[PDB]
Structures are given as structure tokens and as C-alpha cells.
């Protein structure tokens, strides 16, 4: 199912914003940037092991990288996996 080398490579960085705040303060949900290849199970696992907290449910969504023009040539920012990790009522971190 899982492994330690994988559980470590899976969680990448936490995501900050007014929604990632209201999610935390109103529903005990931590908003995270996880690996694109990370399954919902692998995030639950990694958040329970590397953050030592009880995970209720994980909801995931893939964000499309924005495209910016520099005249005749264009650029495209990378696509990433956002993860809404709800936690059981005993809040920590």
C-alpha cells in the first residue's frame, strides 16, 4: 500500500491564502501542495505519519498552470495537485 521513501516524497509544501485560512479556522482542513502522482490514500498516510495527526478525509484537485505571453513567444507555468486534508476534531500541527 505505502512505504516510507514514498510518504516523504508525496507531501511537497503547504499552500497559503484567504481560503486556505478560512478552511483551517472553520473546518480544521489543511490545504497542501502534494505530488501530481499522489493518490488520496498516500496523502492521508503521509499527513498521519509525517505530521502525526488524525486524518478524517482527503479531497484532491489539479490546478492548471497559467500561460503568459512575451511577444511572439509564450510560457506556461507548471500544473500541480492541491489537497484538502480535513482532520479529526483534535486539532494540532
Amino acid at each position: 500500500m505505502i512505504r516510507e521513501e514514498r510518504l516523504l516524497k508525496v507531501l511537497r509544501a503547504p499552500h497559503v491564502s484567504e481560503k486556505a485560512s478560512t478552511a483551517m479556522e472553520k473546518s480544521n482542513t489543511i490545504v497542501l501542495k502534494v505530488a501530481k502522482d499522489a493518490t488520496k490514500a498516500e496523502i492521508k498516510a503521509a499527513v498521519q505519519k509525517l505530521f502525526e495527526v488524525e486524518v478524517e478525509v482527503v479531497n484532491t484537485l489539479v490546478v492548471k498552470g497559467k500561460v503568459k505571453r512575451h511577444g511572439q513567444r509564450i510560457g506556461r507555468r507548471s500544473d500541480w495537485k492541491k489537497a484538502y486534508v480535513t482532520l479529526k476534531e483534535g486539532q494540532n500541527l
Binding site: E4, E5, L8, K9, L11, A13, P14
Partner: peptide
């Protein structure tokens, strides 16, 4: 190697926040 990855995760988690 496990400690290296554990450190790598924390250092990512440092710069990240």
C-alpha cells in the same frame, strides 16, 4: 538514506513556509 529524505522533507517544509 531515510534520515536524508526526512531532512529533505523538513528543509522543503522550511523554505515552503
Amino acid at each position: 538514506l531515510l534520515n536524508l529524505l526526512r531532512e529533505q522533507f523538513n528543509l522543503r517544509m522550511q523554505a515552503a513556509s
